[PDB]
Amino acid sequence: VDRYGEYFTGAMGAESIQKLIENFDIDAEAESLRDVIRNGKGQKKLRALKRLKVVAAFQQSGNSPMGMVLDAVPVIPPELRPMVQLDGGRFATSDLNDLYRRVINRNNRLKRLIDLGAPEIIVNNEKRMLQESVDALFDNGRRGRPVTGPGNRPLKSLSDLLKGKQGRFRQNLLGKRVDYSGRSVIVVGPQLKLH
Amino acid sequence: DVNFFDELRIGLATAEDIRQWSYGEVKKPETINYRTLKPEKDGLFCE
Amino acid sequence: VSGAAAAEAALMRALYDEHAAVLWRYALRLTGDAAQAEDVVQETLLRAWQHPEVIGDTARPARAWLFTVARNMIIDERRSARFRNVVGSTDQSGTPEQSTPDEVNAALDRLLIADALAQLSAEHRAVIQRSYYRGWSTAQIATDLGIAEGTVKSRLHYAVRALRLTLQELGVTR
Amino acid sequence: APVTHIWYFKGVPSRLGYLLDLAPKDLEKIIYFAAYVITSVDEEMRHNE
DNA sequence: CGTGTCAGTAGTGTCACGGATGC
DNA sequence: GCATCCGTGAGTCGAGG
RNA sequence: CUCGA
């Protein structure tokens, strides 16, 4: 940049990828993969087949791939992340609140560094932490070591509300608790009829 | 609210769609006030 | 010139490469949360960029001033806001889930109120449904129905007792 | 500052790596501020100079 | 409000299986 | 062209803490 | 956490 900065443009972080997706020809890269697919060696063709599977979806559907890079993150309504009061006087909140709070804390600090004109090393190292925070909010533990809460317990992300046996699908949609029901011990009754 | 609707569509949420849903921005990181139990303005529980 | 402003950025990147990794370990021992230690590191080095007195003397240990700033940051976080909230997480076990009682008593009362309401004159029924169901004021109902102020007071006064008659005739508990 | 959805970066297979033909680890070095990436280069101006 | 004699991780005994990731 | 490594999954219901 | 089929 100090020498030939007039000739090229580079960047770091996520905003750079946002620029690469913008400076990307969907139809050309799709047909370029097709040309490789029509006549190619299976060793290097299978790797181009699966690429077309991703690119062709963005081409036909009409939705831009830019959605993979976020400028704003949505906040789930509070009753789905409720904060309850305890009989000891203190409180207890969902782990989603601590993840949203950490994203808010680091995003406001980044706004301070941008305003102050702080050195690029602080702003870039701050932008990295905001990436890890949103990554923790959506799927904590996916990359690297998870954000531990008090007691080395991994915080539950938004995607943890849908995963596995404890997720929303299996725990609250495929099976539910029902009214007008009961349970007791069973005892054999010979005098009873089969019905 | 009848129970017959054919398709359920899913798609990528534009950053502009996120603003279309949002009833406001969560600026402050605070939650509530630990005396009045009233949520702080622009917090994670802002009324 | 431009090189003088760039030398300040190379100076900050220098103390990053020599102090940031060690300062992160220090805050990690004091808090135990790595995501919090990163927050303390960024705030401590931000105050180093704002204090040229600490970056001036290289013959004086600047690492010690960083550990002390980080210590007085972790001790401030440890006050009131952490005091009440930090204790529990709903995701964590041992916390009772919030429950809402059933609407059985309310549904039965609503049914009995609807029955006693059907046995009222259209005037009295359209006045109690505008005072208690819509929560308007006495003059608001008077303005809507085109009647007098005391007319709304008298209709409400009787219709209430008319409902008490029908409820006590059906055995509703006082 | 813009941010990436971790579902499409770290989720296997890397959806971003398939779109931009970038390697997963190279993408990992880009997002988390470990390596710059060239967004554009004036190739004609470079030739004329 | 300001801070300054070195100041240094937690936690560590699953596994089968497939396919993208990587030298 | 291939060994590596990552990510995925691993019965149901009930009781007291 | 511990137990029941």
From Swiss-Prot, chain B:
Induction text: 6-fold repressed by starvation.
Positions of transmembrane segments: none
Record-annotated disulphide pairs: none
Function: DNA-dependent RNA polymerase catalyzes the transcription of DNA into RNA using the four ribonucleoside triphosphates as substrates.
Family (UniProt): Belongs to the RNA polymerase beta' chain family.
Assembly and binders: The RNAP catalytic core consists of 2 alpha, 1 beta, 1 beta' and 1 omega subunit. When a sigma factor is associated with the core the holoenzyme is formed, which can initiate transcription.
Name this polypeptide is given: DNA-directed RNA polymerase subunit beta'
Gene: rpoC
From Swiss-Prot, chain C:
Region ranges (Sigma-70 factor domain-2): 15-82
Domain of life assignment: Bacteria
Region Sigma-70 factor domain-4, annotated ranges: 116-164
Induction: Expressed during growth in culture; expression increases from lag to exponential phase. Has a weak SigL-independent promoter, is also weakly autoregulated, no other sigma factor allows its transcription. Forms an operon with rslA.
Keyword Signal: no
CDD domains reported for this sequence: Sigma70_r4
Family: Belongs to the sigma-70 factor family. ECF subfamily.
NCBIfam families: PRK09645.1, sigma70-ECF
Function (record text): Sigma factors are initiation factors that promote the attachment of RNA polymerase to specific initiation sites and are then released. Extracytoplasmic function (ECF) sigma factors are held in an inactive form by an anti-sigma factor until released by regulated intramembrane proteolysis. Over-expression of SigL induces 19-28 genes including polyketide synthases, secreted and membrane proteins. Might play a minor role in regulating SigB.
Protein name, entry field: ECF RNA polymerase sigma factor SigL
Organism of this sequence: Mycobacterium tuberculosis (strain ATCC 25618 / H37Rv)
Taxonomic classification: Bacteria, Bacillati, Actinomycetota, Actinomycetes, Mycobacteriales
UniProtKB/Swiss-Prot annotation, chain D:
Induction: 6-fold repressed by starvation.
Annotated coiled-coil segments of the chain: none
Domain of life: Bacteria
Quaternary structure, from the entry: The RNAP catalytic core consists of 2 alpha, 1 beta, 1 beta' and 1 omega subunit. When a sigma factor is associated with the core the holoenzyme is formed, which can initiate transcription.
Family: Belongs to the RNA polymerase beta' chain family.
Function per UniProt: DNA-dependent RNA polymerase catalyzes the transcription of DNA into RNA using the four ribonucleoside triphosphates as substrates.
Protein name per Swiss-Prot or TrEMBL: DNA-directed RNA polymerase subunit beta'
Organism in which the protein naturally occurs: Mycobacterium tuberculosis (strain ATCC 25618 / H37Rv)
First and last residues shown, out of full length: 99 to 147 of 1316
